[model samples]
Target chain A: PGDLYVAGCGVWLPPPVTTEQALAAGHCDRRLASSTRMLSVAVADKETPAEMAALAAQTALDRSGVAPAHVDLVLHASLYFQGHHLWAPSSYVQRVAVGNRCPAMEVRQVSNGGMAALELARAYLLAAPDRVAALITTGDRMHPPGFDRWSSDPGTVYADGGTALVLSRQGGFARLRSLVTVSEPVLEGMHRGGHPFGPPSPEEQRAVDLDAHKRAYVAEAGSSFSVARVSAGQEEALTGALEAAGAGLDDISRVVLPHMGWRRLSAAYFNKWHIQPERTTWEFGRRTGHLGGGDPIAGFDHLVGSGRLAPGELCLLVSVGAGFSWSCAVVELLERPSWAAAP
Target chain B: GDLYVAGCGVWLPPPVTTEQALAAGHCDRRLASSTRMLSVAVADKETPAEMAALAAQTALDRSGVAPAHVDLVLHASLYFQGHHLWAPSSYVQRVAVGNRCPAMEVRQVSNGGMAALELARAYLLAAPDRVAALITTGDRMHPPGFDRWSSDPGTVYADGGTALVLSRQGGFARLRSLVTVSEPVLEGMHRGGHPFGPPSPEEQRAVDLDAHKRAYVAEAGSSFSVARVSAGQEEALTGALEAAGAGLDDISRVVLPHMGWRRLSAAYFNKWHIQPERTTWEFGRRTGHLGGGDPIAGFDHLVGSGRLAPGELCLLVSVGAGFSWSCAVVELLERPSWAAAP
Candidate 1:
């Protein structure tokens, strides 16, 4: 069966704050340019995660012209922050979106929840066979003491943002070509370095846990090894993904790499595989900084909306997170003629 | 072609306390309950609809001899109460249970939550042909100073408690039976008041919405319209249970009418239907009051663990908060059984 497709999406980035502003506010320097959206960075605001999800759904429906009643399965994924801790974000969103009458659920995978949601949606579509559309949303509000563990990773930055995507089995706007994931072997532990037993000093605020960074790395690269190991896992994961899609690295025309640091980690992998890194990481990372898990997806939304890919061209999206886990997906541009008039 | 035998579960009411006790001190009720069995009347105890789920899972693991490993799917259903106001109680339980390997979800249906769970487990088992389980719980902690959206009726008094169990698709124990029905009787939409306001009152007095006599009647069986509908459902379920191989005479062991008031009401219904007065009000309504579906399952557990005759029949009928009614029958004494000796 064909996989579920990304049909529509909406992103909420709290008001962007420069790294300088963050630092001036006694925040960690890693978040200096972090650009945390003002929507709800520390906790759920008057508008709950479900309300935000509902709004995202409405925005998606507005964009795709799909009716709310048409959505069959809705998956709400969030990492942190909500109106209440006991309720499922999906149920609230379902009720808010006026879609509670359908089957719904909430998933928590920390950062890479979006891709995980996509995979889940695909599987659900395949299992049901009769379903037409599935809605997937990922949202999080990093609250006060927002620094969990990844506050010091030189390779990545933290920003508060939420993103939603509606996937459809038939009326999909963008066809999901392929997906690949890598899991690190030893990145499943936690670590920390700070005052073991003292209150936070007014000047030296607490930092994100070191283990969170390690997990993000493992989630992206697979295994708790170094960057070199991550690169190897990335290559292997990509190879499987391409093979499954009946293609290879050479067939790729565009790529969306998770905006980590200034460096494009995919370059080394692409170079090793003899593929050009011309189209990956294009200024999206530089412009938006790391929007947490929203970086690559928001990048894809911008690029696709901008009509960047030509006819029959292939696009690859890669993301890495805690757990040293990495994922890569391939997409084929089905209509070149329509690209000219793309909105 | 058979449904999968999924998971097992158990639920416990929050620690019990008297209204005067709560009015006296502000202590963590959940911790207090660790030392004592939760009471049915205390407000602000462990009325959280969520905790009963974890207890249920623990009980199931103990009873089924299946660790968390056998639980491929989890359906946690609760009516209300949790930290995240908007987040589903299922997510909270999911994080609490830490069932990360497989799928986890929460379902809701007031008191008939167990019946709904049965349906969910049956669906999952049918699809994967694997073992699945559902856990359900409810808490009626009325935060201090609760009033009806319309008006607080004088009689109702809400209580708190939880119950859980493990069920398989085709069981060797052979206790297979269920009958359920739902009808729209909205006389009590916001009648049985839940915790109305926010943390302020909850922290100050630990009061809960009234649920027992007045609040409950208004919420569940208030108007003549609702009473008629509920009574009709009672009759329908009895008839249905009989059709499902449970005759009136066979159903000799009665886990009777839920509330003291309901017992009186049940007598009228029973007289009309010729059901014996073996119905006892002690097991549930007096102790835990109306704990949603807990009374039904709680009764079954009681009868199953007792010395009831080997061929005797037991009947369970409950009216959920949604005004829905469910009836289940179990043929007793085919074999001697002890409830895990725990």
Candidate 2:
């Protein structure tokens, strides 16, 4: 493998709506609001997912100072509908952001799409020695009429935002020590409709209700099987990445976990790994809500900008998707960039 | 830089003749006559992922590659994959390879299969321990939402699945070079509604790609769109050939996208000054367009039918609505057991 660096990163989010507002608007119930412990969630008015992604990409590219010609690949990841059928959102991002002729495409792994794109972008940069850098972006707007941002999956709250990162073979502020991805295809039906095989319900289902699909899947796959598989995949990815980076959980200075609700995070990370909420982006995530595949990138950007992560500090980035795919990466800050404040 | 194609397979439904389509009033006579398509693969009940899995299984079996050796499974599609927030890539992996690998979906519209290949190639080459990757494409262009015949004129959509096994190890064909070119300015050609507004398909009845293209051409200028499309394809073709240390003259066969006659003639045959006999036009004329699977199905048809012999170099050309173009050079090493006797 070749050396990879995080040259620049950025995120674009709309104004946040308070949980009280959501409850008053009937966007969320009281019980769900209390359980999530979230203050507010980003809500987009008119900006589409691709447009937000392009905006973030522009910011990231500007910060990176990477010439357009140096960008060898551009990958835009999304977990929701991109406003059109048979349209290329990645190309739109490229045309607006990089404005280069490199190959631009879409990579999807549900909520873990950002890390998945990063995984591929890293490989792309390493595959060819001359390849300079690759750009990875993720965006999603979980709106109504299809998806319920507050109650789609029950445990987690979704937000509208876009995040981007530039991965370069050359030097940068952070070095990608290791990235590990694990998949359990047997658990693929956990987010699918009933009857292992059937037509998609994009048009049939009036509003997207993930709980119904999960219930259907659990009924068939059994709760024990699903739980064990999910736990095992996450554990494998985390352990593999930590070991590859020659670091342990405790050695990490900060952890950029998925922006799920406190309950999901407590069970998956806090309780399981004995990590405290303070060491993670819990507070920020509670306010920002889950950004689909963009939690890690957004959290990392916040850490860097807010001066929480010092030089030579190690940060763990974790993500999981519906395909039952989990990715864990270890990143070490080489130096504080000009954008970061002195700690 | 050395990659090989171990095996390839296509699972297509029974073909429906253009005459039957005309009789059923599914398409007008003018549209039927313009396409010049003999028949198209029409799916009755099989879903996109199911068809893709079937094709993948056949390719994996033909390749004789162990499931454990498969490091990646990338499923590409042009249409919906039968579920919301679902994973067709994982479905393909579970049903076909039955291996624990990173299965993800890659979409570049019609060039999705090739785009997946590009990523898979990088993945395999990036790690020394990686052995092989499975690339599968599936699409079902049927429904009240899509009028395959009229949605996008000059091309007929078909329902089919195609798979190709790429390996770092030796195989029947050696991949010389693959190049992809993108012209994002023409991306608006597929999008008709307000660029910054919400989706409008629900407001309408069916997809009308011609309307979108017309809207885009009106603004972007017909000459500009045409020139950009032409340039992108030429760039990809020349890049692939040049990278492979070869030229169009060295290509013994050309596997073209399964587009209709007029589009093919205008974009490829007449423009490149190449004859249809030297390409897969005849086969495509009968098969119609297979979305992103055209290149894979075309290559498989050539190899399985013994049309491409050992030591011959074939050019694979693919284009998609993203205004993306991909071209590759594949050299046949030896005939596999799946090929018919010459």
Candidate 3:
């Protein structure tokens, strides 16, 4: 495989609604909030998902200094509705932020979408001889009567934001040492909710209820099988990525994990892997909440922009989604960009 | 992109003729005559993912590729897939492939099938161990929401699924060149008629694609939009043909997008001087538009009917609402067992 690099990454998040504010408004009970340990979450008042994506894309492109002409492709990933039907948010991002003639596409794997887009973008950049870079973006607006942001899935607090990364085969601040993805489609029912294939899940019929689906799936698939399947998929990707990069978990200097709730994170990463909270982006994720597929991108932007990840250090990005797919990537910092703060 | 089309399949519901539609008040005679569409596939109960799974089963079985050998599954669609916050690609994998691979959804409006193919091609070529990527497209255009014939006037939409297996290994047809060109300035073309902010759950249920196009034309100027659409189509066509070292005249067949006669005439026949017999125009007229699956369906029809010869070069032309156009040239090295003898 050809060498790949991360040219730049950025995120655009709306103002946060603190846990206290949410509690005061009866959005979430204190008991539930305490368990999740989420301090605040980004919530948009009016901006749609595409607009947020364009904003993040513009920031990433500006920092990247990669010309619009050099961008060969644009792939946007999202887990929720993009406001309108029969529309192309990827094209929207291209027109407003990239202004390029590249093939713009929308990709989704629920929350693992950002990694999915990155996987495709990396391949696209390496596939052609003249291709320079591909912009990968993820955006989501988990809002209102359609989506119960704080309780939809129960364990995680959905946030409103967009994130972008400029992936290139040419050159960048960090080298993509290795990226690996694994899937267990048999566990896909974990999110389907046993809905018969009919006229869609009537957005008006009910707000998103992921817990209902998970319960149904667990009942049918057995709790042990569901838990083991999820665990195995994530572990496989992590080990595969590390093996490909010739590095182990102990060799990783920083970990950019998904910004899910505390309980979810405890079982999946911190406790299971014995990786301490100090080495992860727990502080940032605590306030930011789950940013759909953009968690990794946003977490990494914080790592590099805040001057946490040092040169010659390897950072691990862990992502999992509803498709029951997991992607893990090992990236080594080659140089600190001018945008990075002083260590 | 370099790859081989191992197999292709389509799962379509029985056709509903224009006469039956007219009798049921589904389509008026004037609209039928304008589109020159004889019939279209209409589903009674099947959803998008189910149809995609059916098509994938046929395509994979014919390709002779083991389910375990499949490395990726990408499902594309134009409309809702029956559930919220669900993964249809995984469903396709569970049902059709029965393999644990990275499955995802790729969308670019009507150009989705090719877009998914583009991603799949890269994924397969990106790694040495990767073998094949299953690309399936399924769309069900129906009911009070999508008046297939009226939603988009010049084009008649149909309900169906299409699948194509792209492999690193050898196959019946070698993919010579696949090119996708876009003009994103026209991104707002399809969003014009839809509502901004949260839409009223009780708002008018019908869709007006012509109205959206008219609004966009008024705002972006008809001259600019028209020129851009034409230029994009030309770019992809010329790029693919040139890369394959052939011209339109040298190509034995063309799998043009399945659109109404007037639309096809303006885009292909009159503009490019292509004879309808040289393309899948006749089959398309009866099948109507299958959204992003048109190219796949068109190619499958040609091969299944034995209209294409063993050494013939077939061109695939596709255009979608994102103002993206893709064109590909594939040369048949041999007729597969699945194809009928001419």
Candidate 4:
């Protein structure tokens, strides 16, 4: 309806684990490591997912200077477990971070969860007249006994961290030009083709394999169709957002892409758009691994914190998830906040 | 958003009576007598997504809304959704509506359906081209993981799916107001030890809600928890009623959570000074709690059975483990064609 702005953003990351240490300890094969081009990953030793999200939320809220009363909604998104069953991680985040009585809820769309939360938060701010701002957060812990982060998804290595962004209808450092999400529900079976829908068995939960499911899905659904749908969906989101923003690819000064491996990034973005790696967060992502849905938020935070994206610049954020869902958003920087360095 | 309840439906399995449950050694007499639950819907082999799809089909068919008109699909659930890392909302969309809208999963524990409603309402209002949004809730609380009767003790969980079609265009009922209140301090009551700790090994063997409650009570005190819960519920109730510019006595009917008799009495009946006849108590006592679906299922029962009259106001009450409370006031414009005669 009206203009939506990004007040502030932050990320909480743990110490990085070097690929050399993983290679020496047999954590992963040389070929897999080389293909992923993962230099280091943020591995959490004890801090849980909700705690990380709360910490990040506090930082973002503090930086934004938005009071608890102004934050009328809290949306926390995550792909994996939040360390408890039949519990509310969003409420936990609200209790420790915002300390307000807004309606706290969790949203899930796999790796695109952060963007999904953004969509809902933006709507919430625009829906009501009195509402000023909403907080969006994403966090995940890819731990042992269930997740093999290194090989669970093959090419993409999962990291343990949290990212937070404050969105407001009130004035902020950046304005959201446009946000678009595209869905291809027909390809939802790509994540679980050979398995029947039932209570997850111990074996299934303990062993995580995306390649096996992808193989089964491709054998039946055809590889060409699957690839075509994925490509089309991503392009649709990108084009839709750009069109809504009244801008072209050349107008975007920086691109905050998903923290996928080099091969996947090349196949989808680098090769498809002919975009240079230097214009994006390729170097930072190579060292940070995948922070689930927080990739976009973390990448944007890095760009602004390092003063890479200056005033009067436009940044595009891209996200994708297992639900065959893709989201792209355009953000225009109005002014550099006190937290950002001089360009 | 000025939305309407276009259609609502529920797909429930066969009911298991308390007599049959006691004979099978599923629940003890003390638990049965305290809950006052006569029966609970139990599924044999149906999955959450399958049940949800069935419910969506029935709801959409009754709403007379074309598949292309669905702008968004939101599926809510509080339990395991069959597969790991898979999207049940998309599964529901593929099986039932077959629309190409954005489908996603939303969770706020048992109040998930209402949470989805909040977002869907905002989404429909944030844009003008959007017509309608489909919201569905489903869960299978079966053995080896969740103990329907003994897990929570006070509430009996059931296996079923419920759906609601909310539209910005028109429908039989008008959504007057919906208010949600959160008390995050109570989030620790559902988990053992610390709210930030990892899950224990018993998650697979069985889920014991009483154990967690006892631990949380030992630390936080029973009085503190109860007081906060009651206050949150009151806040939501007053907020919704005030927003609708109505009083408690103005509502002709109330759709309450399918919690057991004791909890319902403590939260609504005794606290609000309302009688059981004004609410869907009898219907809910037999159907048991449907997780986030209680509000949808309860409201569906009233409309489908023709219990609500034209111009009458109905109130919906929903709560979750996050200690989130949601209350909504709905006004029936007329008896829908699909509704049965009273």
Candidate 5:
């Protein structure tokens, strides 16, 4: 029913640091390294999250050919700090990328943030007939002194990068057939139960240990409850999107899944859903690691840019976050853009 | 054209009197005297999300909105949310609504609550079936990271949570108009980088907003900063009033940001020639600044305390450090059961 289009998509990633390098430096153990099956993870040297997001936004905006004035909104999503306190990273993205005066703000739903922003941008475009386009960007730098990219959550590997997507009411390469988001707030404690609620503990704890929090939560809430809620949320989102799009799982040509580690992906998507790794961005993701909220956008960008998905093929974009929020969208590629590399 | 405020609420902790601050050497005499703030809400044990959930419960209960009807929950805050990489908005949704609606955090510093409102309005209007949205703001300005009294001088920060329920169906008040204006040029005022490059505040032992402001003013010139700030506020205020087809004279009560008397006087009272009685100055001086929550708390106090009358228009004004400003007009249709006896 909605006419929103994916006008342009872009991602900016730094050079990769291999698993061997991480193991040699004692950043990760041999067991953890093998479990992830990650070839490398993007490592940011000096570029901050906002700078990276702005760079990606520049590419997306240039590709879309949407003028500055036509841009109605700008939403930047992030799971980690954007390198500043009380600073506006969305405004920085706006100032550097579009240079237009729009209601720019940051939207945070953890790893689901990019998809959440896409949902909001779609609504924003549809809310007003005259509103032309909205820009959605996600950026994160999973660095030391606070986050352990390799062993933070044990099963997943985090990376540093940014991804941008332009949504328009006018036209684009892909038509957004349907997008649905489902949240299971009962599982919200999975991220923060181990620690008492107080001021931020960046100074006290040098690195974040998500496994400890998960264990604490599972001890209290029971592992069965967490698993049931997580599975239910993902199912509802996926079913709703596919139903609304008038398509079935079998009709989808490609799936843009979250760039989580191998074990997590195998359990969640590979084995549970019986989706083969060939139909998804598994290889690309194993090399790039997780890009927080940018996974779905980055995966979709890879599929289109690499000439993997042909016109009229339907793609499913799946994402989830620490808040126990799940978003699934069904996308129909209308035509291959000029920027796509030759197949 | 069809948005209404179904309900609103605020959860403020016991006030720590200015006398207590002065005695404890927490606030200096000049700073205390200039703010004219009697007390500030201080939370001893309660966290930001807890306070927010408490406020949300009250608002949701009063609004008579079912958990199923709440389409969105947005939690806004200006400071640390008591944890790293955690979802405070989801916590609020779990404890307050107990529903599986899409909950997220919206941040524009102090303008966060209004920013949430803007998105909520768009969200509800974007779809025909959407019923209502919950907007909440909670902040605890405390301890090793922040020195509330001296952080931004002239303004005293408080600990509290505020919530507003916006719906498409009906409510006690109709949202006449809402407008937000942003000036990204002044974004550097809070950051003070080399050319002010990207900010890196993790190294600082404590937040010093005044130092940043001073550096920004010195580099950008006071005239340029003041003029831009004034223009942005004026644009938002006038835009909202114009959209509502109401002038300043038509507004019975103005729900202003809970900034100190000095900042209010220079920005609103002196410039707009608005009398203190016509605004929430007395209430704000007693309540202290609630970050992005000032507008919500001010409006709640006005309606709950029976200061606003039926058929009267109240103007809500809010601003943030990103140099963003929002103004909204709300016309009270009738007093609800929660209002104090007049």
Candidate 6:
């Protein structure tokens, strides 16, 4: 049986800006990055989409020792406004950083975009078995608010950043055990509070009620299942996944969780799953803020690239997205001969 | 080398209000049946987001498949409206369908939505080899004026429908080949003088007009890619794809071609490659009436169930949306035994 593997990764975050500066500057504020899983490029000053993507791609190539031409697919995932009204960041990056005309596609999973793109990559590899490699990259620059801010609720504090991963069939650093997804239609309203597509009005800001917004959004979206449901569902799903692979929870040495702030209900659900919340969320929440979708892979790359992983060690990555959906993936690490720089 | 196959299939469409009243309505609208390769259920009415999903789930079971039980993934390709607005339709379908309880995600490729779902089935089977089966579904509804007529051509023709299905390593049918993609960025603009997003006020619409709009929209966007296609980037892409697979001459029966009247230039491009012209345009221009992703499988059924030849060479499928262009292929008569009822 051919197995899906994570071969290499990369990311680009608009250089860190404190929430305070963002708020004072009359823009939506978000958290900064404290740690990451892969080599990342953070611009100190505001940089164009082209410049930032180039930096991230360079860092990824340097760390993975894989060239661009070897890449078969490029999956670009982003939610930030990159100034270009029409240019797809994927094509820009492919043209600028990883040139060779390998097929590419642009994806807007918006929030859980990274995982969605990963899932897409997994599917593409599945279809074309002969194709050995794919590069999945995301760049988000949500520094400027599309509309006027309505409130200071902590959930709206989304920062800017990007991340990329180059997955391959062979010569993988880690073996992907399983990818599980659970959709919680119940919590769809939480993120609907923010305005997308168009800017908000002054009346919308003053009358903007996060609670009401959450309630209406959820009511309209309908309940499919959610993080709590996913947590419970994971008990059965994970067991089956492991059973199929002939493995178990005892095999896991570390857990990686979605960076849903400490107070977020999802944080509590992780506790129910018996996952170590501290290593996954507590450590990075204060510094980098929440990176929306990029945090999982970014954080995972930080851990693995830092020489923190060991041979035979199993790692778990859990992510919760806008649909109130949850995704869990388990990987077994292959030991490297020696430690290397984080790039 | 491992092979990929498509197993079960299902669909949920925005219920037709007028159809229930018409005694001969079933004739006008082609509904899903149980004995076919896929099962389908039309919403009872313009079902709310949740109910629309329940319909999709019921259709899956009514069709006799359990995607939830398998160590499989759910790839939802749908279009819808409402709160939590940007969430992928796959996520919504995952919860609503209920069969894929384990792991789920969404894939938003718009009109090529189901074809994208079919590709997922192909991928899961081919890559990890752990997934013997997978499920995919889609839905659309009457929100604001999703299918409202427009003086502008682009938005004038969007109707609501949905599709869902499960795919196994090998079973009822095999997905012998496929080529799918989304042409964003360069391909995102509206060429037919149609409003790109929400319709604009008459005055605003007038103000938005430009030289490009004047040059292309006058002919309903046909000129942009049609007149200029041979020298355009899309030409390079089309040619490269044919080269990647065998030349287009290798294909005997085409499942369907989903290009609008204007972009039929793509069909001629297919002709350039010597692909057989057993096309769906004649039927689709009348029966399916721009059914979006449903046509990918529906037309394949048309070809296969109609006794498309055993050694007919190849079956080609292509879709072109506002910002996307996707292509796919499959072996002809890969499953003669599975052919039933038709």
Candidate 4, position B21, lDDT: 97
Report the C-alpha lDDT of model 2 over A274-341, residue by residue, as the tens digit: 99899999989999999988999999999998999998999999999987889999999999888888
Q: Which tens-of-lDDT digit does each residue in B157-187 have in candidate 6?
A: 2233333343453433334544444333223
Candidate 3 structure quality by residue, lDDT tens digits, A1-343: 3788999899999999999999999999988898899999999887778888899999999999999999999999999877656667788888889988989999999889999999889888877678999999988888776788988888799999999999988899999999998988887767764442222233224688888878877777789988898889998999999999999999999999998889999999988999999899999998998888899899999999999999999999999998689999999999999999978
lDDT of 6: 0.46
Better of 2 and 4 by DockQ: 2
Candidate 2 structure quality by residue, lDDT tens digits, B1-342: 589999899999999999898998888988877778888899987878889999999999999999999999999988877666777888888789889989999999999999999999999999789999999999888867688788888899999999999999879999999999999887777875553333343322466788788888887788988888989999999999999999899999999987778888898889889999999988988888888999999999999999999999999999988789999999999989989977
Compared with the true structure, the alpha-carbon lDDT of candidate 2 equals 0.88
Q: Write the per-residue lDDT of candidate 4 for residues A232-310, one digit (tens) a residue.
A: 9999999999999999999999999999889999999999999999999999998888998899999999999899998
Question: How many Å off is the CA of B152 in candidate 3?
Answer: 1.7
- The lDDT of each candidate is 0.47, 0.88, 0.87, 0.88, 0.88, 0.46
Q: Candidate 4 or 5, higher TM-score?
A: 5
Output the lDDT of residue A121, model 2. Answer: 92
For model 5 chain A, the run of ten residues with the poorest summed lDDT: A196-205
- DockQ of all candidate complexes: 0.09, 0.57, 0.50, 0.54, 0.52, 0.11
In candidate 6 the C-alpha lDDT for residue B290 amounts to: 27
3 against 6, candidate with superior lDDT: 3
Kindly list the per-residue Cα lDDT of model 6 for residues A210-304, writing each as its tens digit: 45555554455444533345456446545654665567776777666555445452445455656555545445543454455666677777667
Per-residue lDDT value at B300 in model 5: 94
TM agreement with the true structure for every prediction: 0.57, 0.97, 0.95, 0.96, 0.97, 0.65
lDDT per residue for candidate 1 within B113-216, as digits (tens), equals: 44444434433433354344444444443433332110122112334434443345443223435554433232133222221211110111222333323543
What would the per-residue lDDT of candidate 1 be over residues A1-343, giving only the tens digit for each residue? 5654666766655555545555667654544334322111222333334445556666665565557667766666654444332223454455455343344555433445566556556655655457677777655554444243124444455545556777777765667788765544233222211111111111112444454434544555455446566577677667867887888777888778765553434354445555454577545554455555555566676666677776578888776654344567887766533223464
Model 5 chain B poorest ten-residue lDDT run: B195-204
